[PDB]
Amino acid sequence: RPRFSFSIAAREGKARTGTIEMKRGVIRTPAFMPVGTAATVKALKPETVRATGADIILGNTYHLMLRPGAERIAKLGGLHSFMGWDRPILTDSGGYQVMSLSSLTKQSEEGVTFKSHRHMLSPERSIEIQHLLGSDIVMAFDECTPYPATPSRAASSMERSMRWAKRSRDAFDSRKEQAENAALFGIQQGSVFENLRQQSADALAEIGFDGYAVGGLAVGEGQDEMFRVLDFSVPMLPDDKPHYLMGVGKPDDIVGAVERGIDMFDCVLPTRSGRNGQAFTWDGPINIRNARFSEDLKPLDSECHCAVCQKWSRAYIHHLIRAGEILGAMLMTEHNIAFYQQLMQKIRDSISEGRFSQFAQDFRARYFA
Amino acid sequence: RPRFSFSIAAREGKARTGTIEMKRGVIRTPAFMPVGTAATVKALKPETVRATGADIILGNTYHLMLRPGAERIAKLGGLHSFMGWDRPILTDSGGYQVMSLSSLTKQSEEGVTFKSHRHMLSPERSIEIQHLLGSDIVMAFDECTPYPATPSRAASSMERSMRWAKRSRDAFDSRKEQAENAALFGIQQGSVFENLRQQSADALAEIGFDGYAVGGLAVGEGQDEMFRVLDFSVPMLPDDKPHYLMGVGKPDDIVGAVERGIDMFDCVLPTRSGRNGQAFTWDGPINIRNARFSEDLKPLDSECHCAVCQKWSRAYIHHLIRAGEILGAMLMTEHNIAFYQQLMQKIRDSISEGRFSQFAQDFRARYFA
Numbered sequence: 001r002p003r004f005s006f007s008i009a010a011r012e013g014k015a016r017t018g019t020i021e022m023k024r025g026v027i028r029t030p031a032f033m034p035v036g037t038a039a040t041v042k043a044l045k046p047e048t049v050r051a052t053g054a055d056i057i058l059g060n061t062y063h064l065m066l067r068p069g070a071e072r073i074a075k076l077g078g079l080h081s082f083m084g085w086d087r088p089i090l091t092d093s094g095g096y097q098v099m100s101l102s103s104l105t106k107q108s109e110e111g112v113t114f115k116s117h118r119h120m121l122s123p124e125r126s127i128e129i130q131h132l133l134g135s136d137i138v139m140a141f142d143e144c145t146p147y148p149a150t151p152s153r154a155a156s157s158m159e160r161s162m163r164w165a166k167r168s169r170d171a172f173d174s175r176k177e178q179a180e181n182a183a184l185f186g187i188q189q190g191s192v193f194e195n196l197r198q199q200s201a202d203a204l205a206e207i208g209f210d211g212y213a214v215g216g217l218a219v220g221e222g223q224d225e226m227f228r229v230l231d232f233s234v235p236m237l238p239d240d241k242p243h244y245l246m247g248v249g250k251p252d253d254i255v256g257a258v259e260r261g262i263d264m265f266d267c268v269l270p271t272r273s274g275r276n277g278q279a280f281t282w283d284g285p286i287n288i289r290n291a292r293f294s295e296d297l298k299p300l301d302s303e304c305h306c307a308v309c310q311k312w313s314r315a316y317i318h319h320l321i322r323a324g325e326i327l328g329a330m331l332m333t334e335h336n337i338a339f340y341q342q343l344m345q346k347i348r349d350s351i352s353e354g355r356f357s358q359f360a361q362d363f364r365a366r367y368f369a
Numbered sequence: 370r371p372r373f374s375f376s377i378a379a380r381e382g383k384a385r386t387g388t389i390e391m392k393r394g395v396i397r398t399p400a401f402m403p404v405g406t407a408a409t410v411k412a413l414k415p416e417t418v419r420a421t422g423a424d425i426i427l428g429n430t431y432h433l434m435l436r437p438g439a440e441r442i443a444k445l446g447g448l449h450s451f452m453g454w455d456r457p458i459l460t461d462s463g464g465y466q467v468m469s470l471s472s473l474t475k476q477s478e479e480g481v482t483f484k485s486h487r488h489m490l491s492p493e494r495s496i497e498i499q500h501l502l503g504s505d506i507v508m509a510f511d512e513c514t515p516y517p518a519t520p521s522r523a524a525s526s527m528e529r530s531m532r533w534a535k536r537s538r539d540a541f542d543s544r545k546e547q548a549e550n551a552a553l554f555g556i557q558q559g560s561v562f563e564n565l566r567q568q569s570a571d572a573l574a575e576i577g578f579d580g581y582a583v584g585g586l587a588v589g590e591g592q593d594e595m596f597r598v599l600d601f602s603v604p605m606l607p608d609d610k611p612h613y614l615m616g617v618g619k620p621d622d623i624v625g626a627v628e629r630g631i632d633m634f635d636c637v638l639p640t641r642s643g644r645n646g647q648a649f650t651w652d653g654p655i656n657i658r659n660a661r662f663s664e665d666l667k668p669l670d671s672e673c674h675c676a677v678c679q680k681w682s683r684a685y686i687h688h689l690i691r692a693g694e695i696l697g698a699m700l701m702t703e704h705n706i707a708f709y710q711q712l713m714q715k716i717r718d719s720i721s722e723g724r725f726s727q728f729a730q731d732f733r734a735r736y737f738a
């Protein structure tokens with residue numbers, strides 16, 4: 001396959017369905033990327049992640065540079081070989097995580113220094129770490145502006161991100177092997193302000209990237225506000241390149257974002273919530289720990305085709321989670337990820353058949369009932 | 370198949386290899402039974418347990434009567450359906466666990482009352498709970514004498530166990546469905562005293578059971594003492610019925626016990642130790658958390674045919690366990706159980722080929738080196 005080729009096969013309104021061809025495989029879009037922190041999609045073997053239908057997973061520059069270390073993973077053969085996932089992997093730049101999980105931080109034009117549990121992370125080092133990990137889709141090193149933010153602070157932050165986007169591009173292009181085998185996505189910032197989003201989109205397009213991520217919309221904004229910002233933000237991005245909404249993933253968030261032109265998603269909800277006892281169903285989420293499921297023989301979801309719903313009852317999983325058993329986490333996580341992939345498939349198919357708007361409406365009606 | 374049929378195919382010294390045919394399947398002996406507390410072999414799907422080569426797993430009357438409850442499991446269809454294991458399951462009687470995990474206990478001729486986290490457990494209730502769970506191999510309700518024990522205390526304890534063995538037999542035989550579909554094993558007690566072991570063996574044989582377990586030898590005795598007791602204890606049991614050494618499982622313990630006539634084993638070592646970072650290898654156990662494995666690309670064991678050793682490196686698993694990742698527990702546990710089953714296969718094959726003594730010697734030489 002080519003290093004990178006995004007092709008749109010069908011459209012309906014602002015929604016699009018297609019494929020991204022990369023050396024390690026094809027990614028069907030709209031796509032949901034399970035999150036793999038600490039070089040593992042929590043509680044799942046890579047073959048199980050693949051069985052649920054995932055075409056690509058997300059890795060993180062921040063966590064991996066700390067443990068087990070970027071240089072170490074490179075010495076061992078790369079992240080793919082390390083964790084046993086041979087398909088595409090998108091790595092976040094650390095731009096967000098360094099300010100979310102670090103103990104103490106020092107931000108400057110050069111980058112961000114921090115202490116975990118002292119390290120420096122700059123556009124150049126972020127790109128290099130992603131190279132050492134052997135990432136297929138490299139994310140530019142950005143700054144995720146806190147929400148809410150004053151227009152002045154949002155502007156300063158976005159402007160810095162754009163300067164960092166240019167530095168990310170040059171660092172990526174300077175490494176032959178990386179430039180020839182991986183792809184680079186730029187990240188749009190600007191908080192919830194249209195003029196800032198426009199300036200960011202324009203700056204990113206001027207630099208040129210293989211894909212464009214919409215950053216900063218998963219840090220406190222309610223769905224109404226997020227959708228409102230997507231309404232004017234996505235159209236600012238190049239139409240012929242993938243649009244990636246970072247960190248967004250509640251089922252209904254995803255459907256609404258696809259309706260607004262988004263092609264890729266990632267979020268820890270499926271996995272994290274799964275381990276906490278929340279299972280997704282077409283009738284809305286349920287918390288399996290609830291006593292009403294102690295003797296419920298039905299599967300997590302009545303239509304779900306996943307291996308978990310084919311074999312075990314809500315009653316068993318209820319028992320497992322309430323007992324703190326590892327198998328409980330494994331089963332809840334596989335089902336949730338499988339549910340998310342089934343959602344993406346229904347989305348792709350409906351767009352391809354020109355009935356996505358109807359699908360969106362039917363989905364909400366049942367999900368919110 | 371028949372309700373129960375034990376056939377010995379080959380022998381070498383006191384060692385035997387054969388099969389136990391039961392309605393839900395065939396059990397190859399010598400056999401190792403992975404332990405499944407809380408209706409789950411920790412961190413493994415039942416299909417994975419089966420993939421490692423396990424023919425039967427162990428369930429526990431004590432833990433299940435507390436959570437989720439025996440009557441509840443019966444209402445839901447039985448333990449097999451509940452946890453998704455359709456092969457034979459041996460259930461311990463609770464005789465041991467009630468005195469090991471209970472907060473406060475009250476022992477009497479009638480049975481044992483206790484509080485967990487008030488419940489009564491008697492021979493009759495134990496047998497009934499195992500019936501409600503749908504156990505294939507039911508264990509008599511006994512008393513596991515603490516070690517060490519004075520001859521007087523050991524005698525009193527054993528005598529009570531034998532009276533309870535008779536009560537267990539009658540309770541089992543009184544339930545038509547259970548008597549026709551499951552098997553009943555008696556449990557030999559008597560601490561480390563030959564005369565008490567003899568009296569117990571004789572009492573059990575007089576009552577008559579489908580199999581005979583050697584109890585009380587997994588509560589503090591060193592290997593030398595345990596082997597010494599097995600030397601005179603196993604020969605006291607009926608030759609044509611299975612001999613089950615309860616709670617014994619270190620690799621070398623197993624080899625030595627097979628050399629002494631034991632046909633079945635169970636122990637939490639493989640699973641519990643696996644989650645703690647200990648991996649079994651033909652060269653002895655290793656603790657994967659050790660820094661010397663941070664960049665070791667070799668599999669857990671160089672010869673192991675398990676899925677874990679086919680795909681992941683010690684370096685990856687080291688990282689997983691040190692990060693507290695669930696996949697670490699899953700991988701360590703699958704490998705350890707697979708290693709134990711591979712050990713049983715090597716044992717069965719060597720006995721069948723009349724070269725078990727040589728196998729025992731070669732195994733120790735390398736394992737202890």
Ligand SMILES: N#Cc1c[nH]c2nc(N)[nH]c(=O)c12
Pocket residue numbers: 092093094095096097139142143144145187214215216217218219246247
């Ligand atoms: N909101 C939001 C985000 C979620 N992940 C992100 N990763 C990066 N690099 N930037 C961002 O803005 C976000």
Ligand SMILES: N#Cc1c[nH]c2nc(N)[nH]c(=O)c12
Pocket residue numbers: 461462463464465466508511512513514556583584585586587588615616
């Ligand atoms: N030692 C030892 C044992 C391990 N499990 C046991 N289970 C029962 N019922 N009795 C026993 O003596 C033992």
Ligand SMILES: [Zn+2]
Pocket residue numbers: 300301304305306307308309310335336338339
């Ligand atoms: Zn499911």
Ligand SMILES: [Zn+2]
Pocket residue numbers: 669670673674675676677678679704705707708
């Ligand atoms: Zn192995």
